Amino acid sequence: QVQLQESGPGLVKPSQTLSLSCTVSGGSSSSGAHYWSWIRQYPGKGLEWIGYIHYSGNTYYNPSLKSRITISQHTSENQFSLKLNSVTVADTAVYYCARGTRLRTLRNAFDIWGQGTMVTVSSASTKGPSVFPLAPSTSGGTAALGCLVKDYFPEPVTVSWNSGALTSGVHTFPAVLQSSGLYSLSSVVTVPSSSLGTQTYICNVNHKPSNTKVDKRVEPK
Amino acid sequence: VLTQPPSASGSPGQSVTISCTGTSSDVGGYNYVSWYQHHPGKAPKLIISEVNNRPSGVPDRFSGSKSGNTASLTVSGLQAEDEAEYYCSSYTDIHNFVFGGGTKLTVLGQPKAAPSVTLFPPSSEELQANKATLVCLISDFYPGAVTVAWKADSSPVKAGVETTTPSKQSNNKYAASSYLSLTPEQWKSHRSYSCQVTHEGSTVEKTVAP
Ligand SMILES: [Cl-]
Ligand SMILES: [Cl-]
């Protein structure tokens, strides 16, 4: 059937324009019952309908974004596009294109979607992490101790413990993106409460994009 | 906007209902409720439109209905492939589209597991850098959906809250984290802070104090 496929930049800097493109494939057939739409989905957040373009090229934009957007179509390329002006970190999201339809039984539904294209907005290019200890502070006789890997860009960061000798009870969590446009993550390991006096625990943080490695020893406080 | 439960689950072969609660402007406004299924990384798919119409191509196990300002998606014989994120949508008489915030529907393939929750206060070292971060780490939970709420002296905190989507661990359980970004001065300016984790209708809470 018809398929929609998005293209995007991956990363854009604040104050710049975000340009996305949706190519329509598999037979199309231009019709006033179809509305070509953009919708974005926030990091673990809800959905926002951005606007559409329909038929002869008339547009309708979500009133809160109206002043920053242009949706246009290039039918010779079987594509339609979104320009979003002066983006900030709050514009980070997965952007989807979708076909809305007015046909009976399908009214006001989006009956075809693209896979989404992730867009990250940030002023950073390469910045290594600050590493802070999460000092141990149970029913199973264990204590959790960790490292906070803060304010780096871009992803990814890897963390091992004791040079990778400690893998048991180790969890390295997915990153959050801060309003600063910089990432933070944590790594934790669960170890015997009785060993907190005799045992050394060091998190090894590697951020290859900034060529930085940090070794941080984590003690009781 | 539209209210869905963050999680729903059932074992293979069982049936499960997912609610979507709006106002009389949208759901009950008219019959323009639709539902969407989304598998990570794949195009969302329309599974129900005009409240109760199932498109050709969609498995007969999905059915929709509505009653009040509340619409519902029922999945009948749960199959592994039915595990996905589901969203409801409605047209509004204000000439716009509203969406729910989504429901993760897990088709149980192992025992439910309660999250291990750990809450760290800011390190003295971080405080020296003029930053304060509270760190709530949540691991080994299944199904892979949780709700986190932050509290400063029993009062709900919204600002400074940064929460990850759950990610699958190598044991097929899930991990997530939530951070509360504060200044050193607001850190010391409160009696205590709490991270409250809700999983499967059960709430566990950790608390720290400066
Ligand atoms: Cl049942
Ligand atoms: Cl409380």
Short mmCIF file of all heavy atoms in Angstrom, two decimals, chain B residues 79-105:
data_model
loop_
_atom_site.label_atom_id
_atom_site.label_comp_id
_atom_site.label_asym_id
_atom_site.label_seq_id
_atom_site.Cartn_x
_atom_site.Cartn_y
_atom_site.Cartn_z
N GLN B 79 -2.04 -11.86 21.93
CA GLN B 79 -0.93 -12.54 21.27
C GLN B 79 0.31 -11.70 21.47
O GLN B 79 0.23 -10.48 21.56
CB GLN B 79 -1.24 -12.72 19.78
CG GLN B 79 -2.65 -13.31 19.52
CD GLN B 79 -2.81 -13.97 18.15
OE1 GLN B 79 -2.02 -13.74 17.24
NE2 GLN B 79 -3.84 -14.79 18.01
N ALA B 80 1.47 -12.34 21.52
CA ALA B 80 2.74 -11.65 21.73
C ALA B 80 2.87 -10.39 20.87
O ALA B 80 3.38 -9.35 21.32
CB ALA B 80 3.89 -12.59 21.47
N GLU B 81 2.42 -10.49 19.62
CA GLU B 81 2.61 -9.38 18.64
C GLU B 81 1.79 -8.15 19.08
O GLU B 81 2.00 -7.05 18.58
CB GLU B 81 2.23 -9.83 17.22
CG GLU B 81 0.72 -9.96 16.98
CD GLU B 81 0.32 -10.23 15.53
OE1 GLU B 81 1.14 -10.79 14.77
OE2 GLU B 81 -0.84 -9.90 15.15
N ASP B 82 0.82 -8.37 19.97
CA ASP B 82 -0.02 -7.29 20.45
C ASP B 82 0.69 -6.39 21.45
O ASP B 82 0.19 -5.33 21.77
CB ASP B 82 -1.32 -7.81 21.04
CG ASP B 82 -2.22 -8.48 20.01
OD1 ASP B 82 -2.11 -8.15 18.81
OD2 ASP B 82 -3.03 -9.36 20.40
N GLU B 83 1.88 -6.78 21.90
CA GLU B 83 2.64 -5.93 22.80
C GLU B 83 3.11 -4.68 22.06
O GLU B 83 3.92 -4.79 21.15
CB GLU B 83 3.83 -6.68 23.41
CG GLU B 83 4.64 -5.79 24.35
CD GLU B 83 5.49 -6.59 25.37
OE1 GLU B 83 4.97 -7.56 25.94
OE2 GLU B 83 6.66 -6.20 25.58
N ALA B 84 2.64 -3.50 22.49
CA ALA B 84 2.97 -2.23 21.81
C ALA B 84 2.51 -1.06 22.69
O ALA B 84 1.88 -1.29 23.72
CB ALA B 84 2.24 -2.18 20.43
N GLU B 85 2.82 0.18 22.27
CA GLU B 85 2.23 1.38 22.88
C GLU B 85 0.92 1.78 22.14
O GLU B 85 0.89 1.82 20.94
CB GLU B 85 3.25 2.52 22.87
CG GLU B 85 2.83 3.72 23.72
CD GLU B 85 3.10 3.54 25.21
OE1 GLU B 85 3.93 2.68 25.58
OE2 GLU B 85 2.50 4.27 26.00
N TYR B 86 -0.18 2.01 22.86
CA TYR B 86 -1.43 2.35 22.20
C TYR B 86 -1.86 3.77 22.56
O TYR B 86 -1.81 4.17 23.73
CB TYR B 86 -2.57 1.33 22.63
CG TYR B 86 -2.35 -0.05 22.09
CD1 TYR B 86 -1.47 -0.95 22.72
CD2 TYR B 86 -3.00 -0.48 20.92
CE1 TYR B 86 -1.22 -2.21 22.20
CE2 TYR B 86 -2.80 -1.75 20.42
CZ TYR B 86 -1.90 -2.61 21.05
OH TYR B 86 -1.71 -3.86 20.54
N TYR B 87 -2.33 4.51 21.56
CA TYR B 87 -2.78 5.88 21.77
C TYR B 87 -4.20 6.02 21.27
O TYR B 87 -4.58 5.40 20.23
CB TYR B 87 -1.89 6.86 20.99
CG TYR B 87 -0.49 6.91 21.47
CD1 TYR B 87 0.47 6.05 20.96
CD2 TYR B 87 -0.09 7.84 22.45
CE1 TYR B 87 1.78 6.11 21.39
CE2 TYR B 87 1.26 7.90 22.89
CZ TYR B 87 2.17 7.03 22.38
OH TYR B 87 3.47 7.04 22.83
N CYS B 88 -4.98 6.83 21.96
CA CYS B 88 -6.28 7.23 21.43
C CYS B 88 -6.15 8.66 20.89
O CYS B 88 -5.30 9.43 21.33
CB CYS B 88 -7.36 7.16 22.49
SG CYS B 88 -7.01 8.15 23.95
N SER B 89 -7.00 8.99 19.92
CA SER B 89 -7.10 10.35 19.42
C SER B 89 -8.55 10.72 19.22
O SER B 89 -9.42 9.85 19.03
CB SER B 89 -6.29 10.50 18.13
OG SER B 89 -6.28 11.83 17.72
N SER B 90 -8.84 12.01 19.32
CA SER B 90 -10.15 12.52 18.96
C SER B 90 -10.03 13.86 18.24
O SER B 90 -9.10 14.61 18.46
CB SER B 90 -11.03 12.69 20.19
OG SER B 90 -12.34 13.01 19.79
N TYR B 91 -10.96 14.11 17.32
CA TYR B 91 -11.15 15.46 16.80
C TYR B 91 -11.91 16.26 17.85
O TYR B 91 -12.67 15.71 18.64
CB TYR B 91 -11.94 15.43 15.49
CG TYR B 91 -11.79 16.70 14.68
CD1 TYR B 91 -10.62 16.96 13.96
CD2 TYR B 91 -12.81 17.65 14.66
CE1 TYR B 91 -10.47 18.12 13.23
CE2 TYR B 91 -12.67 18.82 13.93
CZ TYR B 91 -11.50 19.05 13.22
OH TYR B 91 -11.35 20.21 12.49
N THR B 92 -11.66 17.56 17.88
CA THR B 92 -12.34 18.43 18.84
C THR B 92 -13.19 19.48 18.09
O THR B 92 -12.84 19.88 16.97
CB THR B 92 -11.31 19.06 19.82
OG1 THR B 92 -11.98 19.81 20.84
CG2 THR B 92 -10.34 19.96 19.10
N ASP B 93 -14.31 19.90 18.70
CA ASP B 93 -15.19 20.91 18.05
C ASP B 93 -14.53 22.30 17.95
O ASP B 93 -15.09 23.22 17.35
CB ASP B 93 -16.60 20.95 18.69
CG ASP B 93 -16.64 21.71 20.02
OD1 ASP B 93 -15.59 22.22 20.50
OD2 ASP B 93 -17.75 21.81 20.60
N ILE B 94 -13.33 22.42 18.54
CA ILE B 94 -12.50 23.61 18.43
C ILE B 94 -11.61 23.58 17.18
O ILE B 94 -10.75 24.45 17.00
CB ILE B 94 -11.61 23.85 19.72
CG1 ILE B 94 -10.45 22.81 19.81
CG2 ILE B 94 -12.50 23.88 21.02
CD1 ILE B 94 -9.18 23.25 20.54
N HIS B 95 -11.84 22.58 16.31
CA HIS B 95 -11.11 22.41 15.04
C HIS B 95 -9.64 21.95 15.22
O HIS B 95 -8.72 22.50 14.56
CB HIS B 95 -11.18 23.68 14.16
CG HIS B 95 -12.28 23.66 13.13
ND1 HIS B 95 -13.59 23.15 13.46
CD2 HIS B 95 -12.17 23.92 11.75
CE1 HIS B 95 -14.31 23.24 12.34
NE2 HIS B 95 -13.50 23.77 11.30
N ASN B 96 -9.43 20.95 16.10
CA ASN B 96 -8.08 20.41 16.41
C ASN B 96 -8.06 18.91 16.77
O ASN B 96 -9.10 18.30 16.99
CB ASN B 96 -7.41 21.24 17.52
CG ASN B 96 -6.59 22.40 16.98
OD1 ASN B 96 -6.04 22.33 15.87
ND2 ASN B 96 -6.49 23.47 17.76
N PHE B 97 -6.86 18.33 16.82
CA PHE B 97 -6.70 16.93 17.21
C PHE B 97 -6.10 16.84 18.61
O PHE B 97 -5.07 17.45 18.88
CB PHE B 97 -5.77 16.20 16.24
CG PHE B 97 -6.32 16.08 14.86
CD1 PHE B 97 -6.01 17.03 13.89
CD2 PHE B 97 -7.13 15.01 14.51
CE1 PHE B 97 -6.51 16.92 12.60
CE2 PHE B 97 -7.64 14.89 13.21
CZ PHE B 97 -7.32 15.84 12.26
N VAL B 98 -6.76 16.08 19.51
CA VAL B 98 -6.20 15.81 20.83
C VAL B 98 -5.82 14.32 20.90
O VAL B 98 -6.49 13.50 20.29
CB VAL B 98 -7.18 16.15 21.96
CG1 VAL B 98 -8.56 15.54 21.74
CG2 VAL B 98 -6.63 15.70 23.26
N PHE B 99 -4.77 14.02 21.67
CA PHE B 99 -4.28 12.65 21.84
C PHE B 99 -4.23 12.30 23.32
O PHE B 99 -4.11 13.18 24.18
CB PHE B 99 -2.87 12.53 21.29
CG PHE B 99 -2.75 12.85 19.84
CD1 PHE B 99 -2.53 14.16 19.43
CD2 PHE B 99 -2.84 11.85 18.88
CE1 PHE B 99 -2.41 14.46 18.09
CE2 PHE B 99 -2.72 12.16 17.52
CZ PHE B 99 -2.51 13.46 17.13
N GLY B 100 -4.29 11.01 23.61
CA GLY B 100 -3.93 10.53 24.95
C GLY B 100 -2.43 10.46 25.10
O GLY B 100 -1.69 10.62 24.11
N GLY B 101 -1.96 10.17 26.31
CA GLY B 101 -0.53 10.13 26.55
C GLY B 101 0.05 8.74 26.36
O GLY B 101 1.23 8.52 26.61
N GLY B 102 -0.81 7.80 25.95
CA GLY B 102 -0.37 6.43 25.63
C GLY B 102 -0.45 5.41 26.77
O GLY B 102 -0.36 5.75 27.96
N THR B 103 -0.63 4.16 26.39
CA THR B 103 -0.69 3.03 27.32
C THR B 103 0.20 1.95 26.82
O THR B 103 0.08 1.53 25.66
CB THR B 103 -2.10 2.41 27.37
OG1 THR B 103 -3.00 3.35 27.95
CG2 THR B 103 -2.09 1.12 28.21
N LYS B 104 1.15 1.50 27.65
CA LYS B 104 1.95 0.35 27.27
C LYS B 104 1.18 -0.89 27.58
O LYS B 104 0.83 -1.12 28.72
CB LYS B 104 3.29 0.32 28.01
CG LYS B 104 4.01 -1.01 27.85
CD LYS B 104 5.00 -1.01 26.73
CE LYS B 104 5.98 -2.18 26.94
NZ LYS B 104 7.35 -1.87 26.47
N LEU B 105 0.88 -1.69 26.55
CA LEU B 105 0.18 -2.96 26.77
C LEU B 105 1.22 -4.06 26.70
O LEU B 105 1.82 -4.31 25.64
CB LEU B 105 -0.88 -3.20 25.70
CG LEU B 105 -1.58 -4.56 25.66
CD1 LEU B 105 -2.43 -4.78 26.89
CD2 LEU B 105 -2.46 -4.64 24.45
#
